[model samples]
Target: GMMVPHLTTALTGPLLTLEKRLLDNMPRIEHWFRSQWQEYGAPFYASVDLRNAGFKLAPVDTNLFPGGFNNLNPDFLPLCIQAAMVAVEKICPDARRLLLIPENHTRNTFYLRNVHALTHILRQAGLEVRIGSIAPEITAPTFLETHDGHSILLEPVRRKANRLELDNFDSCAILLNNDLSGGIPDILQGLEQSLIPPLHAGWATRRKSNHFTAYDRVVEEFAPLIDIDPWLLNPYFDTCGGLDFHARLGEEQLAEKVDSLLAKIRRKYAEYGVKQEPFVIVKADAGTYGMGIMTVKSADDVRDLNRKQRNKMSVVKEGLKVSEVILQEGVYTFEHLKDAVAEPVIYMMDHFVVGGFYRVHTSRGADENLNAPGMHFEPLTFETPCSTPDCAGAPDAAPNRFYAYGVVARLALLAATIELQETD
Candidate 1:
């Protein structure tokens, strides 16, 4: 049972023809984005989790501090190199040395590999890059190796007044691989050097509801350009305030909120002739790494919860309490690889779509969250680079369908730009 309430902001296509709606008019699509980019710039980098329901497609989550870069296709390296170059240039034109602060998971080899991969990309992009950890234990430089034999080192950061530096390394900018779910450390408080995402974008301060609120304005402007309802590309989301899952507090209010959103989703389901049962996702509004997440079909699921489920929803990253949560529209994933349900996670840097992979879970249902344990990744190499939509292919064609993915992903990116702007 998952219970999340407090209402917040929270859709796409005609044939649920998202492909035709986006790919058929390639020139107009790119041209439109070109003009919009002039109006708003994207985040330094971001990743978006998307669900393709065959008939309809939309984003489920957008992450500004996206990990999993190691899971991307190797072919994405070139694009990443190019995009990272453009990104660094846009953020800090004179950027020379960059100090990358990674998550405090030194024992996890998989996570270390992601850090290594990100380092390689930045270094290849012509910047001198070094890693500094805010992890308290890393008082001295420590050398470690990943499973892939990539030897990496993490050095403690030294604060010199408002700027941070490593041993013999003063950076022009600070880039965070850490999501800051633990709360913003005092070391990062005020800095003369530019912070890529800035402190406000961290999990401690950002909310999923706010991101979707920005998405509303973005899709409102975009859907009409392609002749489709915004709901087809956006997921409906509501947030719960003053919820303490362990105390079983706000159960009645959370259930009622869940039921109301379900009614809304059910109404949209009827209009589209969707035959499947409607479901809602309840997860921490400010948490990440798939913690504190579950799917429920009816309000009954939210009403009755035992200790096990209550504890599950009680805490998130860095032991953050789940007092407020986001109840989101649960969109089914129709894509599969090796019989495993897979969802596409599109990656971007600057304003360009860089790469992505399919998050696959063999034991999970299409409607269940796939980011849980036992989930693995399968690379979904785009049939074509995200820049051009191939008009020669059919609506659901490999080249075309993935292109729509890029478009929708960028729309979310634009929304993030707007979010940071307004939230600024």
Candidate 2:
């Protein structure tokens, strides 16, 4: 039986209207997506973190190189396998072998589980798959234990001329699980094998500002097509440069930007009769793992940061310095699980919404970040398959809500497609 977690918070306000409208326009909504697919082919894979405020629903972040396959429902594995086959067939019609390049965290047992699951899917899709590491410390094959008491064998990747290969395994394509936050390595450079996501997709060159800029354009075009306010589906954001958090160099400028963004959010709130207080999230323009992020309620929050707070904002994953920040309108999460705040993270592969999970934090408030420490994941129950939306059913029905989520996630994926194209 499919599992569908109850939405403890009742749907209300504009989001409720939006959901019903989306259901009413199912044919048009799907047709618009098909046109987008033809115009901008989807990314190899993506995951969108969405914040549903009951009044509004929007994606707060999009990741091209997503992890957490181990958290997905096992029932969705077949969908992932089928999607992998189609994606691989399109990228390399004759690709039969693939080399998966994972991040350099040999001791993170949970990440290993994700890699293990990913490897299994590729193999089930009829491709020969091998785990390759570029950690520079692997001179030979190594087997690492997973949290589940399972072990995975990782082999050192060797290069010859332009090809990357293992001892006896030669793969036609390279699948990167690493986000390259530390920058692209020379070994990964100038490779003859096809990289699933091109090198530019990495954080070394990618910026959150650029991604949101692209998302703004996408929602601008999409909102009018559905006859809704774009602000209802998009967050107002502005980026500040020349920031040196450690030196406290650009605090005034950053504070000014934060103030201005809050003003804009306030104006929108007033326009829509939204009574809740407005806030903004200040975060690194390039980084992941939820580092270098702080929720700002006012310019004073940005202006009066203590030493500990400043130190926390100075760096992100892989010790990468945060020189730029994107101040985005904070969308609150009204969804809750057992009185704890929860946000939905939707996962997609080759444009299909394969599976997703609820990121729940018992100690966190609805106004704070959910991707921080003390957070846990609840895998979404597939009481109804994501692909099939019951249009004739109620708008808040599990299948319909999942359908709405799938639609917005693909929109973010579409934005990433355009972002990648422009970067190229």
Candidate 3:
């Protein structure tokens, strides 16, 4: 019998209600991050480590990179990707399967350059083999045109920028970031039509409240086109804004809630004697790098966390609103970092562990005004068999490692899932 992986889908109604409460107060989260950025500047750990390793931090300034809500540029992608390639070579060389997806044309160039650099680095290591071609594959949808003819083709953008044009841009990763806020019902209906035909597997990242689609709903409605039991891989929760579940629910409550949801699902499977593998449930409101996650042990703990955080609120420079706590079943953290000051440990993802910087703070000792940021660092180099000595015996380290790999692999699965979602 083909085993049906654990079919756990978190209900989204409570989370949606929480989002509604927080929508009017989105700026608070944004302001908090901006304040942190202004105070500490970029964490110098990465730069210092790179310099120690004899790699010069590039002269390219981040100020030059397009920074804003609607801005998408290639300036930062190459450097980040290059860092990733180097880190991978030093760590997981056997996991050489590289997939690059730039948000726009500017990023496409950066991606190509980094891939070339990766190829050269790999070859110089005496690994004689064609792992894969460095050529980019452009995959745009047919309906990606506007009335004014603003197509998603990289060729048009590249021609204007006068950069090297890719000969063949095969769409390696699926593009599913289409804005669904406008006419979402119609869009989803279109997707449902195509997704209900076959039994297919798909995946999804951490949920953004505004993009409210339950995992079960997708499976129940779309049916066979999307594998009803596809895995969900999320890299930490999106904690950049005050919009995360933790921002309101706090740590303990959110964890409890998640545990409860998972237990209910597990029990359901057990009742049927189903051999379903439990999907990983990551904290969705955690920030950029894999941080603010609880790779829960039991439903009881998840229930406790959610119960505690149910009505919490975060008030800062931005206005006041209820925070949303989401329970998503997918992805896990792989790396560990600790705050020497308060001894708070963070779980991180391997894929994003390096350049995907995160800021930590603690209110353990002080009041809201006195809460201070903690140490910021990348994930451990896979080469280092053990964690930093201080963190070696840490409790969270074990779960962090387990979660990170789970999350990255799941992200790939999510790309496939989203593609299915779009097709539906």
Query: Which candidate leads in TM-score?
Result: 2
Q: What is the lDDT of residue 128 in candidate 2?
A: 91
lDDT by residue (1-424, candidate 1, tens digit) is 2221111111223433767777667788789999988888778899988777644678877888877888777977998999999998888789889999999989888788889989999999999999999999998999988967577999999999899999889999999998776677878987898888876535465565777788988899898988887888888888877467655558888889899999999998888777778888887543543347778889999877887787677654234455468888887765655456667789998988997877656464544432332335544444346665668676655566668889899998998888877766
**Global lDDT scores for all candidate models:** 0.77, 0.78, 0.28
Mind sharing the TM-score for model 1? Answer: 0.89
TM-scores, one per candidate: 0.89, 0.91, 0.26
Candidate 2 residue lDDT tens string, 1-424: 4433344445356776777888888889889988989888887778898877777889877888887888888977889999888788776669889999999989877789989988898899899999999988988999998967788999999999989999789999998888876777778888889888876436474665788989999998888878888887889999876366665568788989989999999998887777777888887644433447788778989876788887777754334456578888988777765566677889888888898777766565554433332335544433456677777787777777778788788888988899888878
Better of 2 and 3 by TM-score: 2
- Estimate the lDDT of model 3: 0.28
Per-residue error (Å), model 1, residue 37: 1.9
Task: Please report how far candidate 2 places residue 329 from its true position, in Å.
Answer: 0.7
Give stretches of model 1 more than 4 Å off.
1-16, 201-203, 246-249, 286-291, 316-323, 362-384
Give candidate 2's TM-score: 0.91
Candidate 2 weakest lDDT stretch, 10 residues: 366-375
